[PDB]
Amino acid sequence: ADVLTTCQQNEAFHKREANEIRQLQNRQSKYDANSGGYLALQAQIDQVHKRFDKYGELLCGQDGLPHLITDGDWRHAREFTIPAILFLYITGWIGWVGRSYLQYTKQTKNPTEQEIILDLPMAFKYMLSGFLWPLSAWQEYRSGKLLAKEDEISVSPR
Amino acid sequence: AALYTHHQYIAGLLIVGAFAHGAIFFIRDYDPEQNQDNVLARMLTHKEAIISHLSWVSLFLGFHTLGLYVHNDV
Amino acid sequence: DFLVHHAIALGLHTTTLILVKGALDARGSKLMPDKKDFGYSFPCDGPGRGGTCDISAWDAFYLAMFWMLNTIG
Amino acid sequence: AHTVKIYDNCIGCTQCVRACPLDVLEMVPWDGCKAGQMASAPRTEDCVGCKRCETACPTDFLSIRVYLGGETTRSMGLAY
Amino acid sequence: MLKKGSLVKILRPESYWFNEVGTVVSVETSKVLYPVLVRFEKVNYSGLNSTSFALEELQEI
Amino acid sequence: MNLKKYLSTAPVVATLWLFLTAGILIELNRFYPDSLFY
Amino acid sequence: ETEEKYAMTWSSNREHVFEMPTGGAATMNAGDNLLYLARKEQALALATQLRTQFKIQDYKIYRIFPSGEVQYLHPKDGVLPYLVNEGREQVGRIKATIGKNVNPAQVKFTSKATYDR
Amino acid sequence: KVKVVVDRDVVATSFEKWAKPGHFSRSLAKGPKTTTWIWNLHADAHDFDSHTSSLEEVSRKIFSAHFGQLAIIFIWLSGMYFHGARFSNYVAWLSNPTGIKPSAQVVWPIVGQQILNADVGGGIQGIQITSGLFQLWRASGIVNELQLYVTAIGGLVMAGLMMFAGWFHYHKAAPKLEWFQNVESMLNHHLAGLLGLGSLSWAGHQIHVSLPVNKLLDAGVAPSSIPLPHEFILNRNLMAELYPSFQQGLAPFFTLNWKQYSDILTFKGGLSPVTGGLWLTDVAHHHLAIAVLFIVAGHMYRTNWGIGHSMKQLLEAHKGPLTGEGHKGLYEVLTTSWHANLAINLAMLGSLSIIVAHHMYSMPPYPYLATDYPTQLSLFTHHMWIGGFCIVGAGAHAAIYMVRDYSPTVNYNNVLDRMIRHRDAIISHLNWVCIFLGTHSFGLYIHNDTMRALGRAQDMFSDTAIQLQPVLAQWIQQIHTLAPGNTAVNALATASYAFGADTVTVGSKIAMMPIKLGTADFMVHHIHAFTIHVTVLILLKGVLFARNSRLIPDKANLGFRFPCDGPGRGGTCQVSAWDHVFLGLFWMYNALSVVIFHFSWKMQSDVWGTVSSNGTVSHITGGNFAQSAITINGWLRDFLWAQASQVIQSYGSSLSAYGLMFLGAHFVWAFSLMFLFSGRGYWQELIESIVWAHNKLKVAPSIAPRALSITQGRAVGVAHYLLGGIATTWAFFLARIISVG
Numbered sequence A: 001a002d003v004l005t006t007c008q009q010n011e012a013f014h015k016r017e018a019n020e021i022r023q024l025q026n027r028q029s030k031y032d033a034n035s036g037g038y039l040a041l042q043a044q045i046d047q048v049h050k051r052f053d054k055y056g057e058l059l060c061g062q063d064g065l066p067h068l069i070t071d072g073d074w075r076h077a078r079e080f081t082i083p084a085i086l087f088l089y090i091t092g093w094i095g096w097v098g099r100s101y102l103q104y105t106k107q108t109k110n111p112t113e114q115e116i117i118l119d120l121p122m123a124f125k126y127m128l129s130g131f132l133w134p135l136s137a138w139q140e141y142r143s144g145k146l147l148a149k150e151d152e153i154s155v156s157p158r
Numbered sequence B: 001a002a003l004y005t006h007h008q009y010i011a012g013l014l015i016v017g018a019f020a021h022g023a024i025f026f027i028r029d030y031d032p033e034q035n036q037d038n039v040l041a042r043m044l045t046h047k048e049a050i051i052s053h054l055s056w057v058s059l060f061l062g063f064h065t066l067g068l069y070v071h072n073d074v
Numbered sequence C: 001d002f003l004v005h006h007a008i009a010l011g012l013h014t015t016t017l018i019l020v021k022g023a024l025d026a027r028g029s030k031l032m033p034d035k036k037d038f039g040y041s042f043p044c045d046g047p048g049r050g051g052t053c054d055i056s057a058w059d060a061f062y063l064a065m066f067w068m069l070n071t072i073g
Numbered sequence D: 001a002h003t004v005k006i007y008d009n010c011i012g013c014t015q016c017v018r019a020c021p022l023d024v025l026e027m028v029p030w031d032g033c034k035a036g037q038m039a040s041a042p043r044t045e046d047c048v049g050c051k052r053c054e055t056a057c058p059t060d061f062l063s064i065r066v067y068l069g070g071e072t073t074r075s076m077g078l079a080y
Numbered sequence E: 001m002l003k004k005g006s007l008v009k010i011l012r013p014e015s016y017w018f019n020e021v022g023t024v025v026s027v028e029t030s031k032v033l034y035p036v037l038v039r040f041e042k043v044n045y046s047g048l049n050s051t052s053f054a055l056e057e058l059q060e061i
Numbered sequence F: 001m002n003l004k005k006y007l008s009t010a011p012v013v014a015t016l017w018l019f020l021t022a023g024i025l026i027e028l029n030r031f032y033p034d035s036l037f038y
Numbered sequence G: 001e002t003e004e005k006y007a008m009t010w011s012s013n014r015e016h017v018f019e020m021p022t023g024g025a026a027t028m029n030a031g032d033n034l035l036y037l038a039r040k041e042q043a044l045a046l047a048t049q050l051r052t053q054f055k056i057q058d059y060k061i062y063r064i065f066p067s068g069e070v071q072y073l074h075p076k077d078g079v080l081p082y083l084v085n086e087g088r089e090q091v092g093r094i095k096a097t098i099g100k101n102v103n104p105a106q107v108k109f110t111s112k113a114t115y116d117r
Numbered sequence H: 001k002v003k004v005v006v007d008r009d010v011v012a013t014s015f016e017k018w019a020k021p022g023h024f025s026r027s028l029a030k031g032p033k034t035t036t037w038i039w040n041l042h043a044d045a046h047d048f049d050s051h052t053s054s055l056e057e058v059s060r061k062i063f064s065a066h067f068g069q070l071a072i073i074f075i076w077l078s079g080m081y082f083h084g085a086r087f088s089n090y091v092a093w094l095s096n097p098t099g100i101k102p103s104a105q106v107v108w109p110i111v112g113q114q115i116l117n118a119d120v121g122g123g124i125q126g127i128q129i130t131s132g133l134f135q136l137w138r139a140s141g142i143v144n145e146l147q148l149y150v151t152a153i154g155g156l157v158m159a160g161l162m163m164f165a166g167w168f169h170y171h172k173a174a175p176k177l178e179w180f181q182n183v184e185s186m187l188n189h190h191l192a193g194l195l196g197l198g199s200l201s202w203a204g205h206q207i208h209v210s211l212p213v214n215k216l217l218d219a220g221v222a223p224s225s226i227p228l229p230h231e232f233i234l235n236r237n238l239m240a241e242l243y244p245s246f247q248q249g250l251a252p253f254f255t256l257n258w259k260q261y262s263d264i265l266t267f268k269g270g271l272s273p274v275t276g277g278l279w280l281t282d283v284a285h286h287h288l289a290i291a292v293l294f295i296v297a298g299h300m301y302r303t304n305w306g307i308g309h310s311m312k313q314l315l316e317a318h319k320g321p322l323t324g325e326g327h328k329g330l331y332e333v334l335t336t337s338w339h340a341n342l343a344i345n346l347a348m349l350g351s352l353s354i355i356v357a358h359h360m361y362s363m364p365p366y367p368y369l370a371t372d373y374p375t376q377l378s379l380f381t382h383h384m385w386i387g388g389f390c391i392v393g394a395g396a397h398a399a400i401y402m403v404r405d406y407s408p409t410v411n412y413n414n415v416l417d418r419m420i421r422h423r424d425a426i427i428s429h430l431n432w433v434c435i436f437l438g439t440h441s442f443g444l445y446i447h448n449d450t451m452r453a454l455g456r457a458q459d460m461f462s463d464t465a466i467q468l469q470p471v472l473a474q475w476i477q478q479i480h481t482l483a484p485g486n487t488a489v490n491a492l493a494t495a496s497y498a499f500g501a502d503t504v505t506v507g508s509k510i511a512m513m514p515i516k517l518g519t520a521d522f523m524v525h526h527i528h529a530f531t532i533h534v535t536v537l538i539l540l541k542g543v544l545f546a547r548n549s550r551l552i553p554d555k556a557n558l559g560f561r562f563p564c565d566g567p568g569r570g571g572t573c574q575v576s577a578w579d580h581v582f583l584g585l586f587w588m589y590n591a592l593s594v595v596i597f598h599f600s601w602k603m604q605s606d607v608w609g610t611v612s613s614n615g616t617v618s619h620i621t622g623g624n625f626a627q628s629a630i631t632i633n634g635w636l637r638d639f640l641w642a643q644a645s646q647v648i649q650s651y652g653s654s655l656s657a658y659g660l661m662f663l664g665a666h667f668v669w670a671f672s673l674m675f676l677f678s679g680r681g682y683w684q685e686l687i688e689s690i691v692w693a694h695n696k697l698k699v700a701p702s703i704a705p706r707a708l709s710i711t712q713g714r715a716v717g718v719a720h721y722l723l724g725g726i727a728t729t730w731a732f733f734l735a736r737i738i739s740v741g
C-alpha cells in the first residue's frame, strides 16, 4: 500500500508537525521568555509534539494526515471497533433506562406530569440499573415484554 | 461538466416524477379490494415501519455526516 | 470521497423518505383519514386538528423537489 | 360551489352551525342521536369553504365535511 | 354486553383510537345510531378524549 | 419540597444533566487531549 | 348595480356606537336601521356583533340582485339556524361515517363522488 | 390628585407555582397531553393581558418585570466592567490606543480553541472586542482596573437592588392602576428627573473627571501619573492649572457671567486632532444645555399644584375642519392600553437607535473610536439592527392594540377612526409608491447591469454617463460646511467632517473626512427609501386591517395571532396582524442589510484608510464604490466576493471563530427555509410513523408528539432566518474589518 503508510514513516506528516511548531514559534518570537504569551504558546508546542508522536502509529495518506480504517480489521480495532462498542454500550444504556422510566410513568396516576416533572428517585433507580442493559433487553425480548403486538398499535387507514 | 450536470438534474426530475405518479396512482387508481394481501397492499399495511426506518437512516446519515464535517471544520 | 458519498446517501434517503411518505400517506393518515376523497393536490384541510398545511401527497412532491435539487447539488 | 356533507355520527351539538360565518348550516329534527337534532347544509351556495364548521365538530372522525369545489364570486369571498 | 366501565377495542378505521382500548362511559338505551360513549387517555388532534361508537365498531376486551 | 419539584422540572434537570455531561467530556479532553483513537 | 348587494335592516331602542364590518365607528339610529354591504359575510359579521354586544335579535339580511329582485336570506325561517326548528328538511346527509366512503378508483370516469352511497 | 396608592402583601413568596408549570394560564394550568403545551407555556409566559382581564394586575406584572430587565442589564454591564478589570489589555491600551487592539475576552485552553487568544498586544492574548468599551471608559476618565472592578461590584449591587425592587413592587407593595395612569407626573419626572438630572449629573462627571483626565491623557501624561479624579475635586489649583475658569469658582454661574466658562464649555465643533473624537468640552456643554432643556420640559404637565398642561386638554384642543374630532379619545387610549404605549415607544426608541447609529459614526463621540474601524462598523451595524427590530415591534403592538384594546366608542370620528375609514386609500397609495420606488430604484441597477454586460457603459446611470447627482444632499452638505461663523456664528468648525472641510487623521489613519455623494449614493438612497416604504406597507397594512377586511369581516374575533381562516375565500393563510409582523421582519432584514452594506462599502471605499507623509489618501477599497456600487454585479463581486476573502481565509488564525460562525450562520439561515417553505400537515403525518415505531418498542411518550403549530412554524422560520442572516453578516463584517481595519 503506497496510498496509506504509518504516520511515523510519512514525510508529509513530519512536515505538518514542523509547520505547526514553526507557526507557534513565529507567534512565540513576539513574546519575552517568562511572559504568559510565551508560556501559553510553549504549552501548545509541547502538545503538538505529544499529538504527532501519539498519531505516529496510525496510517497516513499522501496529505500527511491520519486516515482511519473501519472495515473490521482487528489491527485498527482502536480506531473504530472499540469506540463503536463503547458508543453502543453508552447509548443503549441511555435508551434502555429512558424506556424503563417511561414504562414506570405509565403505571402512575398522572403519566404526563412525570414526563415534565421527573420522579428523580425513580429516574436514578432506572439510570443506575442500565449497566447490564443488553442482558435486561435480551430477558425482555425472550419473555415477550420488549415489543407491543401489531393488534394493539394504532395505524391510519390503508 | 455541462453533460454530467444536465443529465443528473434530468435524472433527479425523473425520479421525483416517478414517485409523484406513484402517489397519484395510490389515490386515483389503487383499489384495495382488487389487491387484497398482495405485495402492493402489504406496502400500505407496514407503511409506518417503512417510513420510520427511512426516518432512522436519514437521521443517522445526517447527524454523522454533518457531525464529521463540522468536527473537521472546527 | 467517503464524506460526500454519505452526503449523497443522506440526500437519496431523505428525498426518498419525503416521496415514499408522500405515496404511502397519499390515501390517508391519522391527521386526515379520508385524504383520498380530496385527491392528489389540495391546499390543506384548514387550521382544525392542529393545522393541516402541506398535508396532500402533491405537497410531498413539492417538499421532495427541494431535497432533490439539494442532493443533485 | 363547495359541497358540505353531514355524516350519521353527528351528535347534534350545534357547534358547526354556531361557527358558520355564512349561515350555510342549520339544525333539523332527527331521531338518530340523543340530542334529537342533526346539522344540515341547505345554503352551500353561500359556503366560502373556511372549514370553521369542521374545526368546531367534536366527533372522531368529523360528522361535517367540506369538499372545496368550483369557485364563484360568493365562494372566493369577493366584495368586488 | 357493554356497561359504564367496560374496556373496548376500537374497530372504526378513521378513528384516532383505532386498535386502542377505551373505557365505556355510557350506553344509550334509546334507539340511536352511535349509543356507546367511549373515553380514552390519549387526546386526538383536536385535544378531545371521547366519541360515540356503534356496538359493531367495538370489541369487549 | 416545592423548590425540589421545580428543580425536577424538565428544563432544570436537562440543564443540570447536560452541564454535568459537558463537564465530564470537557474534563476528559483537558486530561486526555487529542484522543483520535482508543 | 352590476353585482349582488346585501341590505341589513334592524331596530334599536338606543343610538349605540358599533363597528362597521368595513372598518370604523358608526352610530345606529334609535329606531329603524338599513345598511348596504357587498358580502353576506359582512352582514352576518355585523349581525353577530348586534346580537352579542347590543342584544338586537330583530335583524333581517336581504340579497339585492342588479335586476331589482330582493331575496330575504337571514334568519331564513325566522328562527336562528343553531336552534332546531320544525319545517326544516335535512340537506347534505350521508348514511354511516366517512370511513364507509368508497375509493376514487371505484368512481373513476363517473359523475359519482366517494361519499355518494 | 397625583398620589401614591399601593396594595400591601398582595402575593405570597412561595415556590408552589414554580412546581406548577403554566399556573398563569387557565388553558395551561391543567398540564400537557401533547408537546404543543410545552411551546404554548413559553409563547404565552409574558402575554400578561391574556392571563388576567384586570388592567391593574397586568400593570403590576409589567412594572415588576421591568425591574427584572434592569437587574439583567446591570449583571451584563457589571460583566463588561469586570471583564475589563480582570481579562483585558485596557490599562496597556490607554498607553498605546492606536497600536494595541482592545481585548476583554480570554478563552480557556481546551480542544485547541486557545488559537482564538489573538496577539492583541498589551501583554495578554484574547478576542479583539468591537463594543467600543475601551473608548467609552477612556472618555469616562477610567485609568486603572480598581475603577473598573468597583464599577462591576456597583453593577452587581444595582442588579441586586433591581431584583429586590421587582420582587418588592409585585409581592409586598404593588401600586394600584390609578398610580400607573399618572402620565402627566410620569412625564414630568422622566423629562426633568431621568433625562434632565441624568444629563446634568453626567455633565458633572465630564467637567470634574472626564475633562481633566482626558486633557492630561491627550497631552501625553502616563495614565498612572494622572491624578485620581477626586484630587481634581479636592485640589482646585490642580483643576485651575488645566481650566483657569475654576479659579473664579461658581460665582460666574450665579452671576450670569457664563462666558467665564469658555474653557470648560465650548462650541468648537469638529474633532480632536489627537483622539479623532468630539471635544469633551463640547460634550460637557451639550449635556449642560440638554439637562436645562429637559428639566424645563418636565415642568409642562399639571400634577398637584394647578399650574401645567392637561395632556387630555392639549389632545382635544388639536382639532381642525379636515380631521373630525381630531385627538379626542387618544388620552383614554394611551391611559388604558399598555400595547398602544409599547407601539409608540418602540417606534421612537427603534428610530432613536438608527439616529444614534448615524450620529455616532459621523461625529465620533469617543476618543480613538473613529480610527478603531472594527468598533465604528460594529456600533453602526448593531444600533441599526436594534432600531429595525424595535420598529417592527411597534407594528406588532400597534396591531395588538387594534385587536385587543381598540373600541369604536373611544375612537369615534377621531384621527384613528378616520384613518381606518380610508385604509383602502392609504394602502393603495403606499402600494403604488412601493412599485414606483422599486421600479425606479432597483430598475436603475438592473438597467446598469444590462448596459455594462452589453458593453454600453455610456448608456449607464453613473458619474461618467447618465448622472443622477443627489443635488439636494450635495446642497445641504455645502450649507453645513458654510455654517461655522455664518448661520452658526459661534461654532468654530462643522458639526461633522462628513459634510465637508478637512480630513482628520489620528496617526496615519483617517478618523473622518467629507463623504462625497454621487450617482451610486443617489441610487442606494432610493433603495433605502424603497425598502422602508415596503416595510411600512406590510406593518401598516397589518395595523389598519388587524380587525377586519373585505376578505375577513370578523378578523378581530379570530385574534392577533392565528394561522389563517382556512383554505376557503380562495385561501386565507397569513391574514392575521401577527403574519404581517412576520412578513415585516423579512423586509426589515432586507432594508437594514442594504443599509449596513451601503455603510461598510462606502466607508471602506471613500472614508476609512491611511494618509501618507506626502498627504495622499489611500482608502481600504481604493474608491471602487462610485463605479462598482451602480450594478448588482459590482455589489456581488467588489463587495461580497472581495470582502468575504478575510472570513473564508480565517481558518488556522485567531479570526477562525468568524470563519466557523460564517458557515454556522449560513447553516442556521438555510435550516430556517425547512420551516418557512413547509407545512405542519406533512410533519404531523411523519411523526405518526415515528410514534408507531416507539409504540412498537413500548417507548412512546404520554406527552403526545405534535408538529409545531402553523404559527410556531412561521415563528421558528423567521427567527432562524434572521439569526442565520444577521450572524452571517456579523462574522463577515468582523473578520473583514478586524483584518483590513
Ligand code: CLA
Pocket: A094, A095, A096, A097, A098, A099, A101, A102, A118, A123, A124, A126, A127, B052, B053, B055, B056, B059, H689, H690, H691, H693, H694, H697, H699
Ligand atoms: C427514552 C427515550 C427514547 C428511546 C428509547 C427512543 C428510541 C428510538 N427512537 Mg426516539 N426520540 C426520543 C426519545 C427516545 N427514542 C425523543 C425525546 C425524541 C424527540 C427528539 C425522539 C425522536 C425520534 C425521531 C424523529 C426518530 C426517533 C427514532 C427512534 C428509534 C430508532 C433509534 C433512534 O433514532 O434513536 C435516536 C433518537 C434521537 C436522535 C432522538 C433524540 C433522542 C433523545 C435525545 C433521548 C432522550 C433520553 C431521555 C431524555 C432519557 C430520560 C430517562 C430518565 C428520566 C430515566 C428508537 C425506537 C427513529 C425511528 O423512528 O426509528 C425506527 C426516528 O426517526 N426518535
Ligand code: CLA
Pocket: B054, B055, B056, B058, B059, B060, B061, B062, B063, B066, C010, C014, C017, C018, C063, C064, C066, C067, H667, H670, H671, H672, H673, H674, H675, H677, H678, H682, H686
Ligand atoms: C441546511 C438546511 C436544512 C437542514 C440542516 C435540514 C435538516 C433536516 N431535514 Mg430539512 N428541509 C430543508 C432544509 C434543511 N433540512 C428545506 C429547504 C426543505 C424544503 C421545505 C426541507 C424539507 C424537509 C422535509 C420534507 C424533510 C426534511 C427532513 C430533514 C431531516 C433529515 C435527516 C437528518 O439529516 O437528520 C439529522 C438532523 C440534522 C442534520 C439537523 C441539525 C441537527 C443539529 C446539527 C443538532 C444541533 C445540536 C446542537 C447541540 C445545537 C443546539 C442549538 C441550541 C440552540 C439548542 C433533517 C432534520 C426530513 C426528516 O425529518 O427526516 C427524519 C424530512 O422528511 N427536510
Ligand code: CLA
Pocket: H011, H012, H013, H014, H015, H017, H018, H023, H024, H060, H061, H062, H064, H065, H067, H068, H072, H163, H164, H165, H166, H167, H168, H170, H171
Ligand atoms: C425570590 C423568590 C421569589 C419567589 C419564591 C417568587 C414567587 C412567585 N412569583 Mg415572584 N418575583 C420575584 C421573586 C420571587 N417570586 C422577583 C425577584 C421579581 C422581579 C422580577 C418577581 C416578580 C414577579 C412577577 C411579575 C410575577 C411573579 C409571580 C410569582 C409566582 C409565580 C412565579 C413562577 O412561576 O416563576 C417561575 C419562573 C422562573 C423561575 C423564570 C424566571 C426568569 C428570570 C426572571 C429571568 C431569567 C434570566 C434570563 C432571561 C435567562 C436566559 C437564559 C438562556 C438559557 C436563554 C410565585 C408566587 C407571578 C404570579 O403570577 O404571581 C401571582 C408574576 O406574574 N413574581
Ligand code: CLA
Pocket: H062, H063, H066, H067, H070, H179, H180, H182, H183, H185, H186, H189, H190, H193, H194
Ligand atoms: C426622578 C424621578 C424618576 C426617575 C429617575 C425614574 C426612572 C425610571 N423610571 Mg420612572 N416613574 C417616576 C419617577 C422616576 N422614574 C414617577 C413619579 C412615576 C409614577 C408617575 C414613575 C412611573 C414609572 C413606571 C410605571 C415605569 C418607570 C420606569 C423607569 C425606568 C425607565 C427605564 C430606564 O430608563 O432606566 C434607566 C435606569 C437607571 C437610570 C438606573 C436605575 C436608577 C434607579 C431606579 C435610581 C434612580 C433615582 C435615584 C434617586 C438616583 C440616586 C442618585 C444617587 C447619586 C444618590 C427608569 C429607571 C420603568 C421601569 O423600568 O421600572 C422599573 C417603568 O415601567 N417609571
Ligand code: CLA
Pocket: H430, H431, H432, H434, H435, H436, H437, H438, H439, H442, H443, H446, H534, H537, H538, H583, H584, H586, H587
Ligand atoms: C428578489 C426577491 C424579490 C423580489 C424581486 C420581490 C418583489 C416584490 N415584492 Mg416581495 N418578498 C420577497 C422577495 C422579493 N420580492 C421575499 C423573500 C418575501 C417573503 C418575506 C417577500 C414578501 C413580500 C411582501 C409581504 C410584499 C412584497 C412586495 C414586493 C413588491 C414591492 C413593490 C415593487 O417594487 O414592485 C416592482 C418590482 C420589482 C422591484 C422587481 C423587479 C423590477 C424590474 C427590475 C423592473 C420592471 C421589469 C419589466 C417590467 C420586465 C419586463 C420583462 C418581460 C417583458 C419579459 C415587489 C413586486 C410588496 C408589494 O407588493 O408592494 C406593493 C409587499 O407588500 N414582498
Ligand SMILES: CC1=C(/C=C/C(C)=C/C=C/C(C)=C\C=C\C=C(C)\C=C\C=C(C)\C=C\C2=C(C)C[C@@H](O)CC2(C)C)C(C)(C)C[C@H](O)C1
Pocket: A070, A071, A072, A073, A080, A091, A092, A093, A094, A095, A096, A097, A099, A133, A137, H697, H699
Ligand atoms: C436494545 C434496546 C433498544 C431496542 C432496539 C432494537 C429493537 C434494535 C432493533 C434492530 C432491528 C430489528 C434490526 C437491526 C439490524 C442490524 C443491522 C443490519 C446492523 C448490521 C451490522 C452492520 C452491517 C455492521 C457492518 C460492519 C461491521 C461488522 C464492522 C465494521 O468495521 C464495518 C461495517 C460494514 C460497519 C432500544 C431502541 C429500545 C434502545 C435501548 O437503549 C436498547
Ligand SMILES: CC1=C(/C=C/C(C)=C/C=C/C(C)=C/C=C/C=C(C)/C=C/C=C(C)/C=C/C2=C(C)CCCC2(C)C)C(C)(C)CCC1
Pocket: B015, B018, B019, B021, B022, B023, B025, B026, C020, C023
Ligand atoms: C453491483 C453489480 C451488479 C448488480 C447490481 C444490481 C443487482 C443492481 C440493483 C439495482 C436496483 C434493484 C435498483 C433499484 C432502483 C429502484 C428505484 C429507483 C425505485 C423506484 C420506485 C418508485 C419511484 C416507485 C413508485 C411507485 C410507488 C411509490 C407506488 C405505486 C407504484 C409505483 C411503483 C409507480 C452486477 C452483478 C449486475 C454487475 C457488477 C456490479
Ligand SMILES: CC1=C(C/C=C(\C)CCC[C@H](C)CCC[C@H](C)CCCC(C)C)C(=O)c2ccccc2C1=O
Pocket: F014, H674, H675, H676, H678, H679, H680, H681, H683, H684, H706, H707, H708, H709, H710, H712, H713, H714
Ligand atoms: C421541521 C418542521 C417540523 C418538525 C419539528 C418539530 C416537531 C420540532 C422538533 C423538536 C425538537 C427536536 C425538540 C424536542 C426535544 C425534546 C424536548 C427532548 C430534549 C432532550 C434533551 C436535549 C434534554 C414542524 O413541526 C413544522 C410545523 C410547521 C411548519 C414547519 C415545520 C417544520 O419545518
Ligand code: SF4
Pocket: D006, D009, D010, D011, D012, D013, D014, D015, D016, D017, D038, D039, D053, D056, D057, D058, D059, D062, D063, D064
Ligand atoms: S359540530 Fe359535528 S356533531 Fe355537532 S352538530 Fe355539527 S356536524 Fe353534528
Ligand code: SF4
Pocket: C043, C044, C045, C046, C047, C051, C052, C053, C054, H563, H564, H565, H566, H567, H568, H571, H572, H573, H574, H679, H710
Ligand atoms: S395557513 Fe395552512 S391550514 Fe390555513 S388555509 Fe393556509 S395552508 Fe390551509
